[PDB]
Amino acid sequence: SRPSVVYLHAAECTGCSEALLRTYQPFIDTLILDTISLDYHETIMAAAGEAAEEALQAAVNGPDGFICLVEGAIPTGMDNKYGYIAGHTMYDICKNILPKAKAVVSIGTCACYGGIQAAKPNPTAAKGINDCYADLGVKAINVPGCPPNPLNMVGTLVAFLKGQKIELDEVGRPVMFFGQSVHDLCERRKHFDAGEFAPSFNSEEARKGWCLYDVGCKGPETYNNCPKVLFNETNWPVAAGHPCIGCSEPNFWDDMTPFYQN
Amino acid sequence: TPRSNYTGPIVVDPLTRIEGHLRIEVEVEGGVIKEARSCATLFRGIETILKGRDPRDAQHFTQRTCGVCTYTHALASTRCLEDAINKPIPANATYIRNLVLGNQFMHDHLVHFYHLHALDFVDVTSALLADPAKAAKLANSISPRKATTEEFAAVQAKLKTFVASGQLGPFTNAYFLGGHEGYYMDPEANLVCTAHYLQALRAQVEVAKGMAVFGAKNPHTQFTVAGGVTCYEALTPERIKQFRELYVKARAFIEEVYIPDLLLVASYYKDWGKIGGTNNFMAFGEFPAPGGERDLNSRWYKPGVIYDRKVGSVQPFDPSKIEEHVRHSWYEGKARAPFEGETNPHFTFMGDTDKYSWNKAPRYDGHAVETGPLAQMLVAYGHNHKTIKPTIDAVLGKLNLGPEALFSTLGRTAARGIQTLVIAQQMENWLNEYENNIVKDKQIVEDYAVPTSARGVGFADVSRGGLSHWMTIEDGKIDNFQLVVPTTWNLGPRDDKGVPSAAEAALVGTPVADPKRPVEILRTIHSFDPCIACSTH
Ligand code: SF4
C-alpha cells in the first residue's frame, strides 16, 4: 500500500543518506512508517548478506513497482571492478535494477555528475548515473549538492508521489529548488553590488559580514537554494563566514578550485 | 551462549548497518569461528586526486572521505596544514573547533547505538508482545525521564499496524523474525528500546542542528581555514545561546535515554563480555588546549599505546612508528610510513584469499592494534583521567563485571557510551571557557600563507579512533597526501607477517547459533563501528 522506495549506494561517502536523516518536512520516522515503504537501505536495514539481497530482489520484482534513489557514482575503470557488492560490480547491479524502476532520482553531486571520485585524475573512471546509463534509457532526476539539502531530496520525491509537474533545468535539476543562483538569494548581495568585499578572513570587512567573492565565493556560478531555505533550519556557509565552494555544480572539484580565489 | 555444530564457511556481503561496502568471510568449526577476513570492496582514490592541488583545498576534498564522520577529515586536514605552517592558532578557533567536534561525537554515537547496532540485540517483533504498562515501569525505573502506559500502548499500536501491513521496510528479513536463540531480551525491554529507537530518529536531527550553529551546516561543515575559523557570528550571544540550548537538550537525551538503554542491553548480554576481545590498543587523544594545538599531550585526554591489555602500563605514542602494509591488500609494493606512502592499485579478484581488501593494514611498531572509543577510554584510564576512570569503574560496578569484560564486544559497545557521556558533560566547561575567553579575545582567525616547502601531520581521535593526515608540500602544492583512518586500523586485513587486524582477530572464537542468520558476526563487527569510505578513501 505505501509506495516502494529502493535506495542504492554506489561510490559515495554516505553524506546524502545522512542528509536524508535530517529531514524535517516530514521527519524520517513519519516518512518510512507512513509516507513510503523503504524496502532497501544498506545504512539502516536489519538484514545483511543473502537476506539483504533477497529483500532487494523482492522489492525490485515487486507488484506496485518502485522508485529508486541512487547515491554515489559508478566506477567503470578496470572492468567495473573498483566497486563490488555481494560479488557483483556496481555497474552490473545498477544496469540490472535502474531500468526496472518507475523512476530514478540521482541524489548528491556524485550520482548526478561523478562527484569527488571523478575529480582529476579520476582513478576509477567514475561516472554519474545519467552519463553511465544513458544508453539504457535511464533518465534520472538530478538532485545535487555535496550533500543536497534534505528539503530538495524529499521535496522532489514527494512531488513525484503527488503526480506533480517537475520541471528540470539543462543539467537535470528541479528548477523549483535549483532555479536560482545562490548569489541571487544571498543576503550579502547588497555588499557585492556596493563593491564591499572582505580581503582576507582576519579583516574588518569579514568581521562586519561583507561579501566573500574575493576570498573565493562561487555563489554567482552556483545553483541551489541554500540562503533561502538554510541547512538545519538555521545556517549556511556564507552566513558562517566561509565562501560557497559550488558543490551542486557539475565538475566543481575541478572547475571551482582553488576554492579561496576567484 | 547458544551455538550450532556448523563446520564450513560463512560470507556476509553486504555487511549492512555500517557506512560503506564491506564483505566478511569466516571459517567455522563446531559452530565456532576459527578464522576471518575483512574485505573492503570499494576504492575511490582521494589521495591520488589530491596530488598537485592547493593545500588550502585539501580539507574540502578529504571531508568527502565520509559523511557519517562528517567534519572530522576537514579538521584533520586543517590541523595538518597548520602543522606545516607552524604558526599560532587563535585560542577561539580551538574552542569552537572542540565544541563542534564534541557535538559530532554526541550525534554519531547516538545514531550508531540506536540505528546501526541495536537491531543486533533488540527484537522488534517481540516488542509487539509486551505489556505496555510493564514497559513503562521498566522505562521509568532506569531513567528520570518518565513515560506513561498510554504512550507505550500508542507505540505498539503504530508498530502493529506497520508489521500487520506486511511491508516491513528496513525490518524486512531481520534475523530475529520467527525467533532466534541469540536474542535474549524480554518483550518489555524490546519495546522500551524500540520506542527509544524511534524517538532517537527525531532527536538526532536536533543534535546535528547544533553543529550548524557555528559550523554552517550538517552534514559537511564549512567554517574552517588553515589559521582558524570564519564564523564571526559565533561571537554573538544569540548564536552561543542557541548552541547551548541545543547542547543541553542533546546531553539530556544522551544521559536519560541512550545511556540507560545501553546499560539495559548490557545487563541481558553479559556473556558477550567474553566474546570479541583483543589485546593491544592505540589512541591519539583529543580536544587540544588553547595554545596547545601542536602538542598532543595538551589534549583533554591524551594519546597512548597499550600492549597485552596492560592498561596500567600505558606507553607513549610515537607517530613515527606508524607503517601501512599491503601484502594482503589490493595495492603494489611493500610497507610504508605515511610521509612516504603510495596508493597504486593492484586488484586480484573478488573472493581471493591472498589479496582480499582495498584497506591497507596499518601497524604500530609492527603490532596490530585496535583504535576507537574502547582504546581511547582504556588509555585514559591508565592515565588516571579525572572523569573516565571513575566512570568506567562505575559501569563495571553497575553490571557487576570484572575489568576483563572491558576487552570484548560488550566492553567495546559500552566504551562508546562512556565516551559519549564524558564528552557531553565536559562540553559544559569548554562552552563556559569559550564564552569567558571572548569577553576580551575577539580573534577567531589569522591570515597565514601556504609555505613553498614543508611537511605536516594532523591528528584527531574521533568517533572511531585515531585519524591522521600526512602531507608534504613542494612548490607550494600538494606533493604527497596520505590518510590513515580509524577503520583502516580496525578493519584492515593481515600484514606482511600474516597477522590479522583487530576485527579479524576479534571474530576468532565467536559462537554461531544459525549459520544462515549470523547475528553474532554482526554484533562484533558493528561494535567496531566500521566506516569503509573512511578506511579505504
Ligand atoms: S558572499 Fe558569495 S553568494 Fe553572497 S553576495 Fe558575495 S559572492 Fe554572492
Ligand code: F3S
Ligand atoms: S558550497 Fe554547497 S551547500 Fe550551498 S552554499 Fe555553496 S551550494
Ligand SMILES: [Mg+2]
Ligand atoms: Mg590511506
Ligand SMILES: [S]
Ligand atoms: S562532479
Ligand SMILES: [S]
Ligand atoms: S568524532
